[PDB]
Design a protein around this ligand. Structure first.
Ligand SMILES: Nc1ncnc2c1ncn2[C@@H]1O[C@H](COP(=O)(O)OP(=O)(O)O)[C@@H](O)[C@H]1O
Lengths: 97, 274, 251, 97
């Protein structure tokens, strides 16, 4: 029941934060609203360039990450839960504990 | 001609010996003071009625019924709120936001006046007043474009706030707590809005009323004199409306004609004597 | 699935009726409840529901009557308004649909010409009964106006002209009865007199062409209609006799 | 709570609004100029180009920089603060105090 991403692709579930929180304490929002952040469930093999080798994916797993929601990301639903599939190229940054 | 008795008399005479009308006008002129306005509309029921609205009140309602505080009466009451005066219709909440955050930390409610408030902004505003994040309310500006833009400065100077004019170098994103107007209370229902005890200087008020008196002598009579003095009334005095009772429409015409006659005549007595 | 009952805003108001009646909650897009998220408790309950090409029906609400009757009572503040009966038909309709019931009378006839007149008399009787219920009734056969006229005989005005005006009105209140009698081809003077000879509800029954007690004979005029008819007549006739001049277009 | 951008991407805060007096000739105005400058909060490992491994970005931190903002820059809010995420290629030169 576990799906493994291939190559440069990673799979993460967004955390639903009920958007903003704008811009300070504390406001809600109606349009232009959606989870921009999430935790990484799984990671692919890595990028393949020139076949120097497959250089993996500077983004480890169970990392909390910020990402850009483009066309490149697609959502698919595994048992009982919806999750999203994206390429590391689409990932912006990582939050540290 | 000064005392309410004499006024009532010339009223009665011009009204073809209807004493009720004569007393009504003297009474009204007494209640709204000088500069106060008196108008007459067709009455629902058979008896004559005098209605009096004191201070600053304009006819627009709350944009969403959810804004209601202290129901019933489907009214919204804001205690010592901030008044926000915008020349433009409000669509996005982005441009709206900074000032609102400034007021939420301020401890106070907020009142909104603009051309209109479109969906995204109303929705965001309603949800925020519901969650109990902020107490807020929003109503349209009083008139048609030149009329409403003209009255926005009245309401502004009355409440001591500054109108945000896109047509000058103030943009709504940049706004300050000092740009906001203040009042003792405001009360809104589906029909009318009321500003109680505005904090604007008595200096500024008599300044703008004086500035309107130069507009009073303007060469265009009837409504221009009528709707302008109306504005004056809202700033200093109060407004009154006389509803004419009649059984049928023809009686309504006769009585109401006599009433406006008595009205003009009493005003004439006040001005030029008898 | 069915469309909601009315035109948009009134109907939006009626959705809340359905909601509180069935103990369910309306999903309002303009609040921080979202159309996508709703739970089984958000739904309303009913005993049964029935739908056809025409109407939708709920056989009962599962919501407690405290809150419901709270809403039937609170809509009454909305009952009086500047919209007269326009609001009252569909609003009392609303109140009834929650509490009371709605009724429709189908008027039978053989032909269209009979149909129109018959239905006219029916709508007349409906208005009349509503008026009777509302303001009460007084003795029919035009005996009311003449009866009050007899009580006003001592009424006098400021000057002789006004006196004559009063006497004119009091004379004119006999008109309805005299006309009723007259349509029978009988002496209005005699019947009106023999009625003025009587007291109380004593009057003339025109169908049986005999005298008697009106209320006992079940001949009733709703007070509202007699009151209104007299008031309105005097309003226009009064102005109409003050005419010293008339201006119009050329023939 | 420091968030690390990955690869060529850096995260920058927008700089101030309005207009200078520029010798006195310049005054506040309707025509708007929106953040053509900013201060850099954080920086990634570097770019990876066709086995050209990791080239460490030429832009240090707390540098004041000018940039052109396309879609390549994305607006995100960290620590309730509005910030921009962009690629070093999207960054123009850097000014010295
Ligand atoms: N059988 C009757 N005997 C005497 N008076 C009657 C009888 N039926 C009706 N009336 C009177 O006649 C009047 C009815 O008038 P009608 O012909 O219905 O026109 P309208 O109702 O517009 O006056 C009522 O005031 C009623 O009291």
């Amino acid at each position: 029941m576990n799906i493994r991403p291939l190559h440069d692709r990673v799979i993460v579930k967004r955390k639903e934060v009920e958007t903003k929180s704008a811009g300070g304490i504390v406001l809600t929002g109606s349009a232009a609203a959606k989870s921009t952040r999430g935790e990484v469930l799984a990671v692919g093999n890595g990028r393949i360039l020139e076949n120097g080798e497959v250089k993996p994916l500077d983004v480890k797993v169970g990392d909390i990450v910020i990402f850009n929601d483009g066309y490149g990301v697609k959502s698919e639903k595994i048992d009982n839960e919806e999750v999203l599939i994206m390429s590391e190229s689409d990932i912006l940054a990582i939050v540290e504990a | 001609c000064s005392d309410s008795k004499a006024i009532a008399q010339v009223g009665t005479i011009s009204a073809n010996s209807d004493e009720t009308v004569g007393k009504l006008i003297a009474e009204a002129m007494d209640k709204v003071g000088k500069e106060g306005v008196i108008t007459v509309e067709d009455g629902t029921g058979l008896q004559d009625e005098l209605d009096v609205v004191e201070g600053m009140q304009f006819d627009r309602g709350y944009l969403s019924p959810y804004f209601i505080n202290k129901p019933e009466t489907g009214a919204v009451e804001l205690e010592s709120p901030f008044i926000l005066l915008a020349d433009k219709k409000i669509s996005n909440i982005r441009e709206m936001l900074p000032v609102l955050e400034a007021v939420a930390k301020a401890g106070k409610p907020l009142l909104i006046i603009a051309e209109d408030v479109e969906g995204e902004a109303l929705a965001t505003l309603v949800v925020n007043t519901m969650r109990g994040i902020v107490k807020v309310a929003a109503v349209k500006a009083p008139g048609f474009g030149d009329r409403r833009k003209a009255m926005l400065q009245d309401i502004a100077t009355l409440t001591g706030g500054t109108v945000i004019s896109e047509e000058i170098g103030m943009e709504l994103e940049k706004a300050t707590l000092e740009d906001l107007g203040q009042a003792k209370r405001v009360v809104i229902n589906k029909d009318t809005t009321t500003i109680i005890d505005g904090v604007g200087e008595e200096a500024a008020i008599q300044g703008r009323v004086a500035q309107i008196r130069q507009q009073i002598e303007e060469a265009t009579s009837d409504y221009d004199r009528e709707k302008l003095q109306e504005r004056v009334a809202k700033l200093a005095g109060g407004v009154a409306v006389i509803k004419v009772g009649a059984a049928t429409e023809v009686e309504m015409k006769e009585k109401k004609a006599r009433v406006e006659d008595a009205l003009h005549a009493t005003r004439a007595a006040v001005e030029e004597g008898v | 699935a069915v469309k909601a009952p009315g035109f948009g805003d009134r109907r939006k108001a009626m959705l809340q009726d359905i909601a509180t009646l069935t103990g369910g909650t309306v999903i309002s897009e303009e609040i921080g409840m979202e159309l996508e998220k709703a739970t089984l408790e958000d739904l309303g309950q009913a005993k049964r529901v029935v739908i056809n090409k025409d109407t939708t029906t709920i056989i009962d609400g599962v919501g407690e009557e405290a809150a419901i009757q709270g809403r039937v009572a609170q809509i009454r503040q909305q009952i009086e308004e500047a919209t007269s009966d326009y609001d009252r038909e569909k609003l009392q309709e609303r109140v009834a649909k929650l509490a009371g019931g709605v009724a429709v009378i189908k008027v039978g006839a053989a032909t269209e010409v009979e149909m129109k007149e018959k239905k006219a008399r029916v709508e007349d009787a409906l208005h009349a009964t509503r008026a009777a219920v509302e303001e009460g009734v007084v003795a029919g056969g035009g005996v009311a106006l003449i009866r009050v006229a007899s009580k006003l005989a001592d009424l006098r005005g400021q000057n002789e002209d006004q006196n004559v005006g009063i006497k004119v009105a009091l004379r004119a209140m006999e008109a309805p009865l005299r006309q009723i009698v007259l349509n029978c081809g009988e002496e209005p003077s005699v019947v009106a007199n023999t009625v003025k000879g009587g007291d109380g509800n004593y009057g003339y029954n025109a169908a049986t062409e005999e005298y008697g007690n009106m209320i006992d004979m079940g001949i009733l005029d709703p007070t509202k209609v007699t009151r209104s008819a007299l008031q309105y007549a005097a309003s226009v006739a009064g102005l109409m006799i003050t005419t010293e001049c008339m201006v119009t277009d050329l023939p």
